[PDB]
Write a protein that binds this ligand. Structure first.
Ligand code: CLA
Ligand code: CLA
Ligand code: CLA
Ligand code: CLA
Ligand code: CLA
Ligand SMILES: CCCCCCCCCCCCCCCC(=O)OC[C@H](COP(=O)(O)OC[C@@H](O)CO)OC(=O)CCCCCCCCCCCCCCC
Lengths: 122, 57
């Protein structure tokens, strides 16, 4: 429903992106004579995978799963940009602004900590 | 007095202190096992069981 800060504070829901009903499978018409914008974009990572450094003999490095250690501080949100309609018919989002980076530290097996700037800047 | 090589014969007719000696020996052995493992873990590299398995380390 319409929630309030006091409803959410401390629950972990401030880090969750909004969701859409299982029944929202419609379609948004794009009017090529129109100007469009993203008024809010929200990215909520759920898994962080890191390529193990393939040893000298190697064969093929896999993407290994990791433990998040920096808590519910990971989501990108309030991102805005115009949605251009190109003339081949494609759409292009060009980010202007938003909370578009989060530092994140995950930990690999054996204890190596891996920080990263989870981001979509520009 | 007892020679040094006989000090532990005082347990031969002392079942209680024999059990206490045996307990202490068992403690020391269990402690070693724990200490050895912990040293091994502090020094083991698990990144390559192909060319740097444990038996190489
Ligand atoms: C389960 C094993 C076991 C047990 C319970 C005993 C018990 C005993 N032995 Mg026997 N013995 C054993 C194995 C064993 N022995 C073996 C394998 C040998 C051949 C080496 C002997 C040879 C032997 C002799 C020749 C004599 C005894 C004697 C004795 C008695 C007195 C020992 C004493 O006070 O030591 C006192 C010991 C010290 C103060 C210090 C010893 C320091 C040693 C040299 C180095 C320490 C190494 C270190 C602790 C690492 C542990 C060993 C490792 C294998 C785990 C006691 C009843 C004596 C006896 O009969 O008296 C009547 C005696 O004269 N023992
Ligand atoms: C399982 C091992 C063990 C056990 C249960 C006993 C148990 C017993 N001993 Mg024996 N003893 C042992 C090992 C052991 N001893 C060893 C290795 C020696 C050679 C030093 C002796 C020498 C010895 C003598 C001379 C006498 C006994 C006596 C006794 C009795 C009374 C306790 C006592 O006086 O302690 C004394 C012994 C000790 C306190 C052992 C000290 C050994 C230390 C812990 C060595 C550690 C070195 C250090 C930590 C190294 C670390 C690494 C390094 C990098 C620094 C009792 C039956 C007494 C007794 O009743 O006899 C009639 C006695 O007078 N023992
Ligand atoms: C009641 C039946 C019974 C049971 C179950 C045992 C069991 C055992 N006896 Mg024997 N014992 C019995 C009757 C029994 N005994 C009788 C009637 C006598 C003549 C008095 C002896 C005399 C005797 C001697 C002289 C010695 C033993 C030892 C041992 C232990 C050697 C293995 C060991 O320490 O593992 C290693 C231990 C563990 C992995 C953990 C053990 C934890 C268990 C579950 C005990 C928990 C606490 C419990 C309430 C204490 C009572 C123990 C029990 C022996 C009564 C083992 C637990 C030896 C011993 O004590 O070695 C240290 C030893 O020196 N026994
Ligand atoms: C099946 C395995 C087993 C057996 C049978 C024994 C048997 C024995 N151990 Mg134990 N021990 C074991 C495993 C075992 N241990 C393990 C795995 C550890 C952990 C590493 C220990 C740690 C340990 C300690 C710390 C002590 C014992 C002691 C003893 C003896 C106590 C009775 C006694 O007075 O002997 C009389 C003594 C003898 C019969 C001498 C035995 C000679 C053996 C073969 C060693 C030979 C000399 C040795 C290699 C020189 C060391 C050199 C080095 C310091 C440079 C007995 C011989 C105690 C001891 O020796 O008390 C004096 C003692 O202090 N042991
Ligand atoms: C409480 C139970 C318990 C359990 C579940 C374990 C489990 C373990 N121990 Mg620890 N341990 C314990 C008690 C226990 N331990 C105690 C009480 C001590 C003090 C003595 C230790 C001391 C110890 C040492 C020193 C070491 C371990 C190690 C290990 C690991 C390998 C075990 C192994 O290979 O044994 C193998 C055991 C045998 C092959 C025993 C064989 C028994 C012979 C064959 C006797 C047969 C005689 C019998 C009377 C005849 C029966 C007649 C027949 C007709 C039935 C494993 C995680 C090892 C490890 O990795 O440590 C980190 C190691 O090195 N343990
Ligand atoms: C954690 C590990 C702890 C280990 C602690 C130390 C282990 C205990 C001490 C071990 C050393 C033993 C010293 C005992 C030495 C000493 O006590 O010897 C003399 C001693 C005499 O014993 P008796 O029966 O006369 O008893 C008198 C008592 O007062 C002895 O307690 O004999 C024995 O010990 C029997 C074994 C003889 C040993 C003979 C060896 C002598 C060789 C000399 C030649 C050397 C090489 C030269 C030739 C090139």
């Amino acid at each position: 429903q319409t929630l309030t800060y006091d409803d959410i504070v401390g629950t972990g829901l401030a880090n969750k992106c909004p969701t859409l009903d299982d029944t929202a499978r419609g379609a948004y018409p794009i009017d090529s004579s129109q100007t469009y914008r993203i008024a809010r974009l929200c990215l909520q990572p759920t898994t962080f995978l890191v390529k193990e450094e393939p040893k000298n003999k190697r064969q093929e490095a896999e993407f290994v799963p990791t433990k998040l250690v920096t808590r519910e501080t990971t989501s990108l949100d309030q991102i805005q940009g115009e949605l251009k309609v190109n003339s081949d018919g494609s759409l292009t989002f060009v980010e202007e602004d938003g909370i578009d980076f989060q530092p994140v530290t995950v930990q690999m097996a054996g204890g190596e900590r891996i920080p990263l700037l989870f981001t979509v800047k520009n | 007095g007892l020679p040094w090589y006989r000090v532990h014969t005082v347990l031969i007719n002392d079942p209680g202190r024999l059990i206490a000696a045996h307990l202490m020996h068992t403690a020391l052995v269990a402690g070693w096992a724990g200490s050895m493992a912990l040293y091994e873990l502090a020094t083991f590299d698990p990144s390559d069981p192909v060319l740097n398995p444990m038996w190489r380390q």
